[PDB]
Amino acid sequence: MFEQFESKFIDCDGIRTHYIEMGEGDPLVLVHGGGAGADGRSNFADNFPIFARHMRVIAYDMVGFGQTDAPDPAGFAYTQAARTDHLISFIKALGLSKICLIGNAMGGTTACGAALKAPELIDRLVLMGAAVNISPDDMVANRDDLAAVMSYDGSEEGMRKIIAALTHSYQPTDDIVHYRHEASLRPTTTAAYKATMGWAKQNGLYYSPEQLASLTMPVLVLGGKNDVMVPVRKVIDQILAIPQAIGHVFPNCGHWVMIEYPEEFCTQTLHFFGKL
Amino acid sequence: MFEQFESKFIDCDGIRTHYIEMGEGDPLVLVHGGGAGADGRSNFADNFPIFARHMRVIAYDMVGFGQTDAPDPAGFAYTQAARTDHLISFIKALGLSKICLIGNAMGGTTACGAALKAPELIDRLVLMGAAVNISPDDMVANRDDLAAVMSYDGSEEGMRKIIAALTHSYQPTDDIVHYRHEASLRPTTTAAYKATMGWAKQNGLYYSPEQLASLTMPVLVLGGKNDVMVPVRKVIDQILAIPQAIGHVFPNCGHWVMIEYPEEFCTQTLHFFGKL
Numbered sequence: 251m252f253e254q255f256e257s258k259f260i261d262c263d264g265i266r267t268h269y270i271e272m273g274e275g276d277p278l279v280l281v282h283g284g285g286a287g288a289d290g291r292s293n294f295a296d297n298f299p300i301f302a303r304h305m306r307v308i309a310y311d312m313v314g315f316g317q318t319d320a321p322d323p324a325g326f327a328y329t330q331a332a333r334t335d336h337l338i339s340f341i342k343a344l345g346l347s348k349i350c351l352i353g354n355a356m357g358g359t360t361a362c363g364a365a366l367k368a369p370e371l372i373d374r375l376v377l378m379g380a381a382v383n384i385s386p387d388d389m390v391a392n393r394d395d396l397a398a399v400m401s402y403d404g405s406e407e408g409m410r411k412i413i414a415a416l417t418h419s420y421q422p423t424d425d426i427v428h429y430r431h432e433a434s435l436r437p438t439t440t441a442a443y444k445a446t447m448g449w450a451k452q453n454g455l456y457y458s459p460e461q462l463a464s465l466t467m468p469v470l471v472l473g474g475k476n477d478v479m480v481p482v483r484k485v486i487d488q489i490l491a492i493p494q495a496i497g498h499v500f501p502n503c504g505h506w507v508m509i510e511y512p513e514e515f516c517t518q519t520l521h522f523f524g525k526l
Numbered sequence: 527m528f529e530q531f532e533s534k535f536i537d538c539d540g541i542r543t544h545y546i547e548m549g550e551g552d553p554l555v556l557v558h559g560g561g562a563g564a565d566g567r568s569n570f571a572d573n574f575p576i577f578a579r580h581m582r583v584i585a586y587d588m589v590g591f592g593q594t595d596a597p598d599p600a601g602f603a604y605t606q607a608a609r610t611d612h613l614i615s616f617i618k619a620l621g622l623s624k625i626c627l628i629g630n631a632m633g634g635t636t637a638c639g640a641a642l643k644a645p646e647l648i649d650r651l652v653l654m655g656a657a658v659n660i661s662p663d664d665m666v667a668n669r670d671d672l673a674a675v676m677s678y679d680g681s682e683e684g685m686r687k688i689i690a691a692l693t694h695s696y697q698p699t700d701d702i703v704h705y706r707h708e709a710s711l712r713p714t715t716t717a718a719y720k721a722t723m724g725w726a727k728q729n730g731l732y733y734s735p736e737q738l739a740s741l742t743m744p745v746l747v748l749g750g751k752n753d754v755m756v757p758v759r760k761v762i763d764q765i766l767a768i769p770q771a772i773g774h775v776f777p778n779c780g781h782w783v784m785i786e787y788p789e790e791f792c793t794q795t796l797h798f799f800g801k802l
C-alpha cells in the first residue's frame with residue numbers, strides 16, 4: 251500500500267530515517283502519532299495531495315516506527331527527548347528551516363519539543379490532538395473508553411475496534427484495516443513500541459504550563475470534540491495555556507482529524523500557513 | 527457616519543425597524559450587540575463589503591437600539607423574548623428563509639433565541655461572544671475588569687476606555703469614538719437601554735444546557751481569548767454544550783472579533799456558510 255509515494259532515506263545522526271515528500275515550495279513537515287504500527291504514510295496519505303498543491307510536504311517515520319531505524323531497546327532509551335532530537339536532526343539533515351510543522355498526538359509532543367528546543371527551525375506549529383499535557387496520572391485513567399485500544403488482541407477484528415474507538419464515524423477500507431493490522435505486528439518495531447509506550451506511561455507526555463507559554467512562534471491547536479484519547483478538555487487547556495494559540499474544535503470527530511475531515515484539516519492549516 | 531449604506535425601514539408587527547443591506551444572493555443577517563448606542567452599521571461596517579461579495583448581507587437595529595422604534599418602556603417590556611420575536615418578525619417581513627445568521631453578545635442571545643423558536647427560518651448560526659449562558663449571578667461578578675464599562679461617565683474619554691476594555695489592541699478612529707459617544711446618549715434609546723440592561727442584569731441572558739443541545743442546524747461558535755465581557759470559558763462551555771458546534775477561538779482578541787479581525791472573521795464565517 252501507499253506505493254504512490256516514493257520512499258526516501260536520509261541519515262539523522264546515525265538513525266536511518268524513512269520519509270516521503272511531494273510538491274514544491276515552502277516546507278511542511280508532518281509528524282505521525284504513536285499508535286502501534288503508525289507511520290507517516292498511513293497517517294497522512296489523504297492529505298498529501300492536497301498539501302502538495304501549495305507546499306513541499308514531508309512525512310517521516312519517528313525513531314522506532316515505520317521504516318525508520320528502530321535501535322534495539324536493550325541499548326537505546328525510547329524517551330521523548332529521543333524523538334525530539336531525531337526530529338531536529340531530520341530537519342537539519344534535509345537542510346530546511348523556517349518550516350511549518352504539524353504533529354498528531356505523540357507526534358504533537360515531538361513537534362512541540364522541537365519548537366521549544368530549536369525555535370529557529372520552525373515558523374509555524376500545529377498541534378493536533380497533541381500529547382503536550384498528559385501526566386503520568388492522566389495515563390492510567392483507563393476509562394471504559396479505551397476497552398478496544400488497551401485490550402488489543404492482535405487480530406484484524408481487534409484493529410477494526412481500535413479504529414472505531416479512535417474515530418467518530420469513519421469506516422476504513424479493507425486495505426487500510428489490513429495495512430494497520432500488519433504494521434502493528436511488525437517484528438522490527440514491536441520492541442521499540444513496547445519501550446516507547448512503557449516510557450510514556452511512566453513519565454507521561456508533558457510540558458509545563460510555563461514551557462507551553464514560552465513557545466515563540468504562531469500556534470494552531472486542533473482537536474476532535476469526540477476524541478477519546480486526548481480528550482477535548484486537554485486540547486482546550488492547551489488553547490488556554492499557549493497565549494498566541496488559535497484554537498479550532500471539530501464536531502463529530504475523534505482523534506484522527508486529518509483522516510476523518512481531510513479537506514477541512516487541510517484548509518484550516520493551509521490558511522494558517524498563509525497559503526489560502 | 528456610515529452614509530455609504532442606505533437606511534431602509536420595514537414594519538415588524540408594529541415596530542418600525544431600521545436595516546441596511548448590500549450584495550446579492552443568499553441572505554445573511556447580522557445581529558449587533560447590546561452596548562450603549564450599538565447598532566448594525568457601527569457593529570458591522572468593516573465586514574459588510576467583504577460579505578457583500580458573496581451574499582446578500584443585512585444588518586438591522588434590535589428593538590430599542592439605533593433607528594429602530596424604541597417603544598416607551600412605561601408601556602413595553604424590554605425582555606429577551608421581545609428581541610427574539612422582533613428578529614423573527616424582521617426575517618419574515620423581508621420574506622427570507624433558510625438564512626445564515628450571526629449574533630454578537632446580546633445579539634447572540636437573540637439569534638439563538640430565533641434559531642430555537644423558528645428553526646425553519648435559519649440554516650446556519652454563528653454565535654460570537656454570544657450571551658447564551660450568562661446567569662443572573664454571572665451578571666454581578668463586576669470584576670475589576672469592568673471598571674471602564676460599568677462606571678462610564680458619559681464622556682468621550684470614558685468611551686475611549688470602554689473601547690479599550692472591550693478590545694485587545696484596537697485603536698478606534700476619532701470619528702468612531704465620536705459616533706459611539708453620541709449614540710450612547712441618544713435620548714430616543716437611552717430609556718429603552720436602561721430597561722434592556724435592567725432586565726438582563728436581573729434575569730440573565732441564558733438558555734438551558736438542554737435548550738442549547740436542542741439547536742437543529744449547524745452552529746459555529748467564536749470567541750476572543752481576551753474577551754473581558756463574555757469570558758473565553760463561557761464560549762468554551764457553549765462549544766461543549768452544543769454537540770454539532772464548531773469552535774474557533776481567536777488569540778490577541780477582545781470582545782469585538784468582527785472589528786478587531788474583520789478579515790479572519792469574514793473568512794471563517796463565509797467558509798462555514800459554504801461560500802469559500
Ligand SMILES: O=C(O)/C(O)=C(Cl)\C=C\C(=O)c1ccccc1
Nearest residue numbers: 283284285288354355356357381
Ligand atoms: O494517531 C495515532 O497515531 C494513533 O492512532 C494513536 Cl493510538 C496515537 C496515540 C498516541 O500518540 C498516544 C500515545 C500515548 C498516549 C496518548 C496518545
Ligand SMILES: O=C(O)/C(O)=C(Cl)\C=C\C(=O)c1ccccc1
Nearest residue numbers: 559560561564630631632633657
Ligand atoms: O458588542 C457590543 O455591542 C458591545 O460593545 C457590548 Cl458592551 C455588548 C454587550 C452585550 O451584548 C452584553 C450585555 C449584557 C451582558 C453581557 C453582554
Ligand code: NA
Nearest residue numbers: 414415417418
Ligand atoms: Na467511535
Ligand code: NA
Nearest residue numbers: 690691693694
Ligand atoms: Na484592552
